[PDB]
Amino acid sequence: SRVYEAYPEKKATLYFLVLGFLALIVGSLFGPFQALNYGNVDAYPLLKRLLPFVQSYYQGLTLHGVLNAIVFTQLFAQAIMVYLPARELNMRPNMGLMWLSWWMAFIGLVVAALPLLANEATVLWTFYPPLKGHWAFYLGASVFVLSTWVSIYIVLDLWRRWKAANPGKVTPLVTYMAVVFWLMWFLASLGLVLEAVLFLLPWSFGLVEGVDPLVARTLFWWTGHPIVYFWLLPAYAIIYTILPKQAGGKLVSDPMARLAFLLFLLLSTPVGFHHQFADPGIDPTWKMIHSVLTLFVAVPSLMTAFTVAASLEFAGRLRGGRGLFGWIRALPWDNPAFVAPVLGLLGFIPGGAGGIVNASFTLDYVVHNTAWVPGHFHLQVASLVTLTAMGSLYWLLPNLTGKPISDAQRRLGLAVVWLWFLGMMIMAVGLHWAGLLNVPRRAYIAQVPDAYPHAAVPMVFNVLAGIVLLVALLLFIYGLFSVLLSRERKPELAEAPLPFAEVIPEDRRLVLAMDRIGFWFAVAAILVVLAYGPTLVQLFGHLNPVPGWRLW
Amino acid sequence: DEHKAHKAILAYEKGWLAFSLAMLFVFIALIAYTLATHTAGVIPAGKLERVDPTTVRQEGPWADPAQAVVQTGPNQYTVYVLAFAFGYQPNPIEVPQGAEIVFKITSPDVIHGFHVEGTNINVEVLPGEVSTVRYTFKRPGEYRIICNQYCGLGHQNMFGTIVVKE
Amino acid sequence: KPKGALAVILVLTLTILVFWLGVYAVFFARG
Ligand code: HAS
Ligand code: HEM
Ligand SMILES: CCCCCCCC/C=C/CCCCCCCC(=O)OC[C@H](O)CO
Ligand SMILES: CCCCCCCC/C=C\CCCCCCCC(=O)OC[C@H](O)CO
Ligand SMILES: CCCCCCCC/C=C\CCCCCCCC(=O)OC[C@H](O)CO
Ligand SMILES: CCCCCCCC/C=C\CCCCCCCC(=O)OC[C@H](O)CO
């Protein structure tokens, strides 16, 4: 193609998307089965005829976790948060590096997959020691995640190059977001990298007899929280800089948008103890500090809610809608690229609400490790992030391929988006509710059918969600292939501008402060030292490694 | 109109951001409170107390389950619980109602949950560490312990029992 | 005034509050 000759970043981007969705599809095959399980219905005999390599509910659960929460979300982030700044800056990302990042991701994913498919690493996506997986799982996962360090390089490159040609100009919006995002992702990433290099790899290679569980978990959750922000921000970039165009309006504030991002750089990483509220050997004063900081990181989404709601209202008003509710009907509800994100945001209301409870230190003892947690996150990632990614098919795919979306394809997109949204909501009810009834997360409950009689009601929701989502998923498979494998090509589509919104003047002072990135980067990194340093120093000073086990 | 909508949008967002901040602060204050009551007993002890999971069943307080329940105060019992694949010892745990129970829980294998159905006890149990938590059972009877951390193929059926005597 | 935006944050504030005091109530019942 002449267009790929001129915009090679289109094709690398496409590869990240497709691989991402393929990861999503396979990971998601296990969802309906898990939903049916949380409804006390056992359809694994079915799954095991259809996919004979699957040995247990927990192998399936690992695949689901790893492929949906690690692989898909990452590919997506790398697609969005590279290509978008590249288009706004109208500059070419380093193509050698972009390809390198892709191969790393693909290679690492392939290597990790082998043990997973072979049933040699049925730990889960959290891989907590001393459950001990195959070295290939840890190594494949490490190289997969490391793929992102290249992405970080790519975007800082593009950035500095733009600044050099444009001294004394403020960073453009998407690029500002992309930069604070990647720098955030860098600090965040170090927890897991540390964990894999100092403990998990030597351990799985047989170089050390055991790992200290508590240090593993503490390092893990260093990365483990900001990762969800690393998953979320690609969606927010789109929600902020694109959706307002799609809805028929404008972004009501660039500075507000920058502020939210900035806050995530500063606050996404020093918070991980909120996943360790029930852990021994971690001081309660530290748990409380981390809790307070977690309530703070809620703030940029509290902000986002308003910035975004106000933008959608503005779009709705521009298109004629009047009243308290009129601006809602006025929006482009026929357009899957608008619908998917907005619906995602609706679910995000109870989502963030669950998050907020989780954050509150003692309140966590009510819900910790119950079905409530899955209830919270499906709202956030399986719903908001996923739907946002889904709706990008309908504007990004054509932009990247020149492949057109038929009227028929659009209608199916709408169906897919709504059914997925709704199935996620139904499920969200069954899980939260089952969680409050003390049902454990990560558990093959259908195989202990008389264990949770009090959950009879939420169980019907989970079954229902289960069937609804299987339908939605089936229809997304057929949907995605129909576009991807489609005949027609209209190259005028690939040469179109991306639908970036215009901004509605102004706190230039604020924008300038927010643009002192190096400064904010350092601050954020200082916060991680202050919030993790004291505890890690004490943990490392008293390591207590323990034998690994394979209980599957 | 565009200029005006912008100022009004911005003006109210500040309203919201200050209220949201207030609300968050009040939650902080309400968590602080819980921290000061007995309800806070279920927060683990932040102190490191290392053990050897390879010998814990052969020597030390976890070696003989029938002696796990030790009176350590006038109205206080310490209980050495082992969480393991796939169950808890002793079974059952027997404690008096109204007494304050310092659970000291460890694992010989892998991580397990220790979630006492009906109560706020919900603590990760890591091999090599003793998790310490405290609770006063106010109502007598039978409480189920659920393992709520994946621990291998027997996870779904790993349950224990605490009996609280009148 | 951004009346619709405001209504979105009302719903959100109420959701947070139903959730939070909800769980706080459950924490104490189990305490
Ligand atoms: C991408 C996905 C994720 C996000 C986002 C996320 C958000 C939060 N999380 Fe979380 N969560 C926790 C804290 C929260 C808090 C404070 C937030 C906050 O960031 C939430 C703030 C968000 C809001 C306050 C919502 C704002 C509303 C918006 C933006 C929508 C407005 C609507 C509009 C505009 C539409 C209007 C349109 C119209 C047309 C009307 C805690 C603890 O403190 C735990 C551990 C609990 C335990 O015991 O394990 C945890 C665990 C999880 C797990 C489980 C990990 C595991 O495997 O063990 C995952 C996957 C995860 C995902 C995600 N989480 N969460
Ligand atoms: C087809 C749609 C989906 C359905 C039917 C569904 C349903 C399920 C169920 C019922 C659980 C809880 C299992 C348990 O606690 O034992 C679960 C686990 C999980 N879900 Fe999904 N799933 C969906 C798609 C996805 C998506 C797209 C995300 C990520 C973007 C996601 C990521 C996760 C992860 C990370 C877990 C927790 C795994 C663990 O504890 O190890 N799901 N989902
Ligand atoms: C288009 C996407 C939306 C899909 C929504 C589909 C609606 C689900 C079916 C409802 C009919 C009622 C079904 C009741 C018939 C059998 C139920 C039953 O007997 O329960 C199972 C069994 O007892 C234990 O294995
Ligand atoms: C128990 C939970 C399960 C039940 C699920 C309920 C959750 C909320 C669902 C939808 C709200 C969406 C509100 C906005 C709807 C947009 C449709 C609209 O306004 O249509 C106008 C017309 O099409 C001109 O374009
Ligand atoms: C046509 C599109 C609309 C249709 C949407 C459906 C309506 C929503 C409500 C319930 C469906 C429930 C289906 C659940 C299937 C069986 C539930 C089950 O297994 O129940 C066990 C029972 O409580 C103990 O034996
Ligand atoms: C139990 C606790 C009770 C909770 C009950 C729900 C409370 C709703 C939340 C916030 C209300 C804030 C709205 C007040 C309006 C702020 C005014 C403002 O900021 O306006 C500036 C502008 O200049 C003027 O024209």
Ligand SMILES: CCCCCCCC/C=C\CCCCCCCC(=O)OC[C@H](O)CO
């Ligand atoms: C403009 C207004 C400014 C005023 C702003 C104040 C907001 C008021 C809300 C909460 C205060 C916290 C009250 C703390 C009392 C908690 C007691 C409780 O809930 O008791 C539980 C249990 O019964 C014991 O063991």
Ligand SMILES: CCCCCCCC/C=C\CCCCCCCC(=O)OC[C@H](O)CO
């Ligand atoms: C829309 C979603 C609707 C959500 C619906 C909310 C329902 C859950 C309510 C409370 C959970 C609190 C459970 C507390 C358990 C108390 C049972 C108890 O005390 O049992 C043990 C005792 O030992 C016996 O002797």
Ligand SMILES: CCCCCCCC/C=C\CCCCCCCC(=O)OC[C@H](O)CO
């Ligand atoms: C528009 C999209 C926004 C979505 C907003 C969803 C927010 C969830 C709010 C309420 C659900 C709870 C239903 C009612 C509360 C149940 C309390 C209850 O019954 O408590 C049990 C108690 O033990 C007595 O039996």
Ligand SMILES: CCCCCCCC/C=C\CCCCCCCC(=O)OC[C@H](O)CO
């Ligand atoms: C709409 C889609 C989103 C999914 C919906 C999520 C539902 C969970 C919501 C709120 C739970 C709030 C806690 C409510 C617990 C009720 C019980 C109560 O109020 O507690 C008193 C009693 O002492 C008990 O034992």
Ligand code: CUA
């Ligand atoms: Cu022990 Cu799950």
Ligand SMILES: [O-][O-]
């Ligand atoms: O992660 O919340």
Ligand SMILES: [Cu+2]
């Ligand atoms: Cu987190």
